[PDB]
Symmetry: C3
Subunit: 256 residues, 3 copies
């Protein structure tokens, strides 16, 4: 199960059926839960917790210190949930005491080759980060978001649930839930209707989300005006409340 | 000249031809065939079913023949075919095909694929292409001969990159690039013909002028595509190069980078 | 040992006595490593290369590899790296070509983050920061204290000026003058790196002279020639304005506007 050419630190803690491939390093204070497969040529550093049934591929560095100059060697953490796939060359950094001391990833995420997850980022569930996506630090990615290849997210931005970014987008402000963005700099285009259909949203919730986009983006209202105008649909539709909530949480502006 | 470092892992079903080298801590997986004289560096992962031809060079930290990660493309067998005299630099990822399309990723001869480049599932690369650092072919991309993609060129799924074309660094390509065309930017826009390339490869003065003219006919005279094509019939019969240009345009159902 | 028994150290390699080398790393022929330097696991080091003192090189890096530049033909070109540099995961640094310097050169105290690329014949000064996936195509000169943010792309032969700043995803095809901030693809000059200047302790007076100099180059409709002439005076009074002026004067590809 554990290749004899792997190095397993004595204070690492592995569940019974964890696999580790040849020439991988599971460093000190690393915990790996049941059914997780660590590939060959993987470096894991702690303190880090990896859950169950994950898959981590060759040339990944998971749990390293951020090279960010404000980190001074504090024992910050990285927590990863269950059923995640972490592909070739992914870098995931642990947190900083200036935020939460913790980088957190949830469950069922797909993190493709050479993606980067900076210190203090928080990823929800069911997200997809396509190749070379970079979260610079303190980035929050809510459930079911899809960021296409080479998407660059600035520090402190929030990516809403079910949002989508086109290839090579450079994101410098929050992306509301469901919004599709493209370009450098990123601009809002429409809504991720395929992601709604993938999740069996009602046709009525979809039409209401279509209106909700118009309210914020196509009617010249201010954010506050838009918020009041959505208030009703938010109460009627949880789907719309998620949209409404992401815009309300965007203290530092939405992508337009 | 053969040297198989004993720290590498070679599957019993892998097939190695004469003069093959494999560096330490590399993995030549099941159903990988490696042709004559090919050099695999250290820290390479090869996964099959994959056929690699002769006199290739594959550098460290490359993953060649992996499955595409979206499990929505489960299926097997799917394959990878790489021809002869290719250079594959550090950290290159090349994925096999999918049963949902052609079941094969294909690379021809004499290509240079630079560090951290990505060749997505079902893509097809011809011969004498250059993919500069971190070029990313998303999937089902066809790159025709002699094309050059500068550093961090991103190509959308299903796009065709024409023979002898050129992309400036950081291009984001969402539509087909006709043969000989130069594109730049995100999103990518057409700027001119790749005259630097045409000169370096020995194109006739006569062919170069006819291509300069044909660019104008497609992009600058305000014709429709379909008109522009009809106007090119006569030049295309006289100049094989103009024919290659015309054909790339004619086979862009997707649309062309304007 | 300090040298992991699973590493490969070439007989011709020269290592100072307290150098550390992790498992499954390669120190190639004619590679020299100075005192206090730590080489991680899974690092490929090739020569002829000289690495200095107290550097740290992380896993999956290839340092001292041949350039893929098709003009390169197997010549013993060099790579020189100074002291107190950090080279993070997956970084690629290629040696020179005989067609230019025969050497790629890096100074001291630089921070080169993951998957950055330093192309053949580049020269990096001191105290630079190259954020993740910054790519220097070749023959790129980066002067001291420059910060290139993530995914900054630098065309071959470009010069990045001292104390300049590029925004995330910048694609730089022209020279960036000293102290200038650039953003976008294609990169555009926005302002000066005032935040940079304050973090390094520049005097109010120098910052003001630099502010005025920016205007002379970017905001008065001067040709380059005319701006240079008009900066002569202030460049004579302030070393920083001279550095600025020199970066404009030495442009081979024109300057970012
Ligand atoms: C002239 C000089 O100073 N160095 C050159 C030399 O480096 P060098 O000989 O270091 O590079 P190699 O890749 O040939 O070998 C690296 C190291 O790995 C070892 N090894 C190699 C293969 C193997 O199967 N098992 C094994 O143990 C060698 O014994 C050596 O110590 O060749 C390289 C091209 O190949 C060039 O880029 C370098 O410029
Ligand atoms: C594949 C290869 O050997 N690359 C090297 C080559 O690049 P390359 O041959 O592209 O470099 P040059 O700077 O000499 O090319 C001149 C200019 O022509 C452009 N151009 C190039 C090719 C083309 O088909 N069409 C075109 O328009 C380039 O973008 C550049 O702006 O020389 C550079 C300068 O020593 C090196 O940094 C590269 O490592």
């Amino acid at each position: 199960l554990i290749d004899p050419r792997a190095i397993i630190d004595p204070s690492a803690r592995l569940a019974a059926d964890v696999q580790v491939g040849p020439w991988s390093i599971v460093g000190a204070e690393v915990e790996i839960g049941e059914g997780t497969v660590i590939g060959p040529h993987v470096v894991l550093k702690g303190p880090t917790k990896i859950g169950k049934h994950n898959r981590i591929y060759q040339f990944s560095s998971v749990g390293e210190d951020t090279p960010d100059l404000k980190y001074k060697g504090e024992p910050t953490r990285l927590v990863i949930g269950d059923h995640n796939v972490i592909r070739e060359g992914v870098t995931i950094h642990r947190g900083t005491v200036q935020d939460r001391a913790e980088t957190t990833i949830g469950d069922h995420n797909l993190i493709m080759a050479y993606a980067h997850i900076g210190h203090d980022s928080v990823i929800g569930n069911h997200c997809i980060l396509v190749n070379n996506t970079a979260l610079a630090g303190h980035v929050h990615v809510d459930d079911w978001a899809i960021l296409s290849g080479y998407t660059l997210v600035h520090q402190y931005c929030r990516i809403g649930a079910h949002s989508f970014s086109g290839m090579g987008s450079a994101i410098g402000k929050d992306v509301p839930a469901y919004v599709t963005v493209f370009g450098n700099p990123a601009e809002a285009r429409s809504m991720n209707f395929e992601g709604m259909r993938r999740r069996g949203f009602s046709s009525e919730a979809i039409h209401a989300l279509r209106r909700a986009y118009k309210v914020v983006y196509r009617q010249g209202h201010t954010v506050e005006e838009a918020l009041a105008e959505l208030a009703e649909s938010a109460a009627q539709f949880p789907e719309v409340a998620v949209f409404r909530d992401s815009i309300q949480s965007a203290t530092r502006g939405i992508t337009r």
